[PDB]
Design a protein around this ligand. Sequence first.
Ligand SMILES: O=[N+]([O-])c1ccc2[nH]nnc2c1
Length: 247
Amino acid sequence: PRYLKGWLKDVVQLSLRRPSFRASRQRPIISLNERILEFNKRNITAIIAAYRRKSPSGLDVERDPIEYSKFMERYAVGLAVATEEKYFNGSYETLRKIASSVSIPILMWDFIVKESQIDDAYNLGADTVALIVKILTERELESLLEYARSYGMEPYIVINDENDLDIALRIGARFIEICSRDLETLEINKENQRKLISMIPSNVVKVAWGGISERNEIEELRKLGVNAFGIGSSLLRNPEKIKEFIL
Ligand SMILES: O=[N+]([O-])c1ccc2[nH]nnc2c1
């Protein structure tokens, strides 16, 4: 990984030691980036809802993951499931159960630093996995991106600044999350997010993530070319708010 500090250094050491999941996949790969493009063609707002318990950017929320996921199946373009253990109180078992209960695309949100975590994502039923430029070298990114593609997944490349966007372009990312939240400091900068969005070619599927809370900001971002919108805490507090974000 990269040289890191603070909680990101801790979570990378944890991920390096995380045991593998050793069962077989029991569902097809359902492409999230293609379903986003289909929603775009249907002029349906494409919302990626997240399930987590703890978060460095929120108070804990304890709710039933299956009631939540089955509700979101009716409205969301896909579901992100936070599986990191210490800072998100996530679990592979939770991802496994959600993936078995719904038929929309599932993104595994974790801090992927070794190929076995991609094996894990595949075997658990996730359709794609996040790769975070801030924690990986260019060599590691390209290797993990190629490894995920060899399973038929199109990884979800997470960027937060200009250096990250440069690396995402270098490595041939086709599916990019422009995250407004710096993971080291937890600060949000939407001006920087919009600058990055303006520098991404049209053929890349773009997801805006980070402090999205209002229908009007979705519409503004869609006008700038963003294809889909990620929303965590707001929907974890009140799932039914997604109906307003779409309608
Ligand atoms: O909790 N999440 O599933 C989740 C998904 C994507 C994100 N991007 N930035 N933070 C994120 C959190």
